[PDB]
Design a protein around this motif. Structure first.
Motif, PDB file in Angstrom:
ATOM      1  N   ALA A 140       0.824  -1.196   0.000  1.00 43.67           N
ATOM      2  CA  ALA A 140       0.000   0.000   0.000  1.00 43.67           C
ATOM      3  C   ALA A 140       0.863   1.253   0.000  1.00 43.67           C
ATOM      4  N   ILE A 141       0.360   2.308  -0.621  1.00 38.38           N
ATOM      5  CA  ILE A 141       1.032   3.594  -0.604  1.00 38.38           C
ATOM      6  C   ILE A 141       0.395   4.487   0.450  1.00 38.38           C
ATOM      7  N   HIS A 142       1.221   4.977   1.357  1.00 38.01           N
ATOM      8  CA  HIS A 142       0.756   5.804   2.454  1.00 38.01           C
ATOM      9  C   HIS A 142       1.265   7.223   2.286  1.00 38.01           C
ATOM     10  N   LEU A 143       0.356   8.168   2.222  1.00 34.33           N
ATOM     11  CA  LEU A 143       0.726   9.568   2.177  1.00 34.33           C
ATOM     12  C   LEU A 143      -0.108  10.336   3.183  1.00 34.33           C
ATOM     13  N   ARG A 144       0.460  11.387   3.746  1.00 36.03           N
ATOM     14  CA  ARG A 144      -0.226  12.135   4.785  1.00 36.03           C
ATOM     15  C   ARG A 144      -0.139  13.632   4.523  1.00 36.03           C
ATOM     16  N   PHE A 145      -1.235  14.316   4.786  1.00 36.52           N
ATOM     17  CA  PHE A 145      -1.289  15.762   4.681  1.00 36.52           C
ATOM     18  C   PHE A 145      -1.345  16.355   6.082  1.00 36.52           C
ATOM     19  N   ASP A 146      -0.215  16.869   6.544  1.00 36.22           N
ATOM     20  CA  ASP A 146      -0.095  17.349   7.918  1.00 36.22           C
ATOM     21  C   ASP A 146      -0.065  18.870   7.976  1.00 36.22           C
ATOM     22  N   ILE A 186      -4.677  11.186   6.540  1.00 37.84           N
ATOM     23  CA  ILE A 186      -3.905  10.009   6.177  1.00 37.84           C
ATOM     24  C   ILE A 186      -4.630   9.227   5.083  1.00 37.84           C
ATOM     25  N   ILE A 187      -3.942   9.013   3.974  1.00 38.46           N
ATOM     26  CA  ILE A 187      -4.506   8.267   2.863  1.00 38.46           C
ATOM     27  C   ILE A 187      -3.862   6.891   2.776  1.00 38.46           C
ATOM     28  N   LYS A 188      -4.685   5.861   2.871  1.00 40.74           N
ATOM     29  CA  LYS A 188      -4.224   4.497   2.697  1.00 40.74           C
ATOM     30  C   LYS A 188      -4.925   3.844   1.524  1.00 40.74           C
ATOM     31  N   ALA A 189      -4.165   3.631   0.470  1.00 38.14           N
ATOM     32  CA  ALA A 189      -4.707   3.112  -0.777  1.00 38.14           C
ATOM     33  C   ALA A 189      -3.958   1.868  -1.222  1.00 38.14           C
ATOM     34  N   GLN A 190      -4.707   0.815  -1.530  1.00 38.90           N
ATOM     35  CA  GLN A 190      -4.127  -0.427  -2.002  1.00 38.90           C
ATOM     36  C   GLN A 190      -5.155  -1.228  -2.798  1.00 38.90           C
ATOM     37  N   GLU A 191      -5.000  -1.203  -4.110  1.00 41.05           N
ATOM     38  CA  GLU A 191      -5.877  -1.939  -5.010  1.00 41.05           C
ATOM     39  C   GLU A 191      -5.061  -2.868  -5.897  1.00 41.05           C
ATOM     40  N   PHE A 192      -4.172  -2.276  -6.671  1.00 37.89           N
ATOM     41  CA  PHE A 192      -3.339  -3.014  -7.596  1.00 37.89           C
ATOM     42  C   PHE A 192      -1.927  -2.450  -7.528  1.00 37.89           C
ATOM     43  N   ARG A 193      -0.991  -3.093  -8.204  1.00 33.78           N
ATOM     44  CA  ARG A 193       0.372  -2.585  -8.299  1.00 33.78           C
ATOM     45  C   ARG A 193       0.430  -1.346  -9.190  1.00 33.78           C
TER      46      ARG A 193
END
Length: 148
Positions: free
Chosen positions: A36-42, A71-78
Motif C-alpha cells: 500500500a502507498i501511504h501519504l499524509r497531509f499534515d 492520512i490516505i491508505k490506498a491499495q488496489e493493484f500494483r
C-alpha cells in the motif's frame, strides 16, 4: 504538486510518502495488505490558512486521523504510478468537497483495520527444593473385654 483550496497549494517534492507492510508475516504471506502507498497531509508540516485549518477540525471524516491530519491508505493493484494518482485524485476531491460549504458530507469509508496476535514466552528453571521424611509410627488403641 497538489492544488489545495483557499489561497495555498502544497508542493511536489515536499510530500510525505510511506510504504506500508501490514502485519508480520509468518514466513508465507498471511495477508495481501502488505502492499500500500501511504501519504499524509499534515498541518504542522506546513502553514495552512485560517479557513482551511478550521475546516479540517470541523469536518469529521474518517480520513482525518485526529490532529486534523489527513492520512490516505490506498491499495488496489500494483503500479505505484496508479496508486499515487488515485490516492491524490481522491484526496484532492475530498479537500475540495470539505472546503466547500455545508451539506457536503459522507462518502468517506475506508475499512482497513485488522491486526491481532499473541506472544508469551517464559522459561526459567531452578530446581533446588528437595525433601525427605520416612518414619513408621503407628498409634493403635483398641479395647477388649466381655460385656456384662
Amino acid at each position: 504538486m497538489i492544488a489545495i483550496s483557499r489561497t495555498v497549494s502544497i508542493a511536489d517534492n515536499e510530500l510525505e510518502i510511506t510504504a506500508i507492510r501490514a502485519q508480520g508475516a509468518g514466513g508465507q504471506h498471511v495477508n495481501k495488505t502488505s502492499s500500500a502507498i501511504h501519504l499524509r497531509f499534515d498541518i504542522r508540516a506546513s502553514g495552512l490558512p485560517e479557513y482551511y485549518k478550521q475546516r479540517l477540525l470541523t469536518a469529521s471524516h474518517h480520513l482525518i486521523s485526529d490532529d486534523g491530519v489527513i492520512i490516505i491508505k490506498a491499495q488496489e493493484f500494483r503500479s505505484q504510478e496508479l496508486n499515487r494518482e488515485a490516492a491524490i485524485a481522491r484526496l484532492v476531491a475530498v479537500i475540495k468537497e470539505l472546503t466547500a460549504e455545508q451539506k457536503s458530507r459522507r462518502a468517506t469509508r475506508p475499512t482497513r483495520a485488522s491486526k491481532e496476535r499473541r506472544l508469551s514466552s517464559k522459561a526459567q528453571k531452578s530446581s533446588v527444593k528437595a525433601l525427605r521424611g520416612k518414619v513408621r509410627r503407628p498409634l493403635d488403641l483398641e479395647h477388649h473385654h466381655h460385656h456384662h
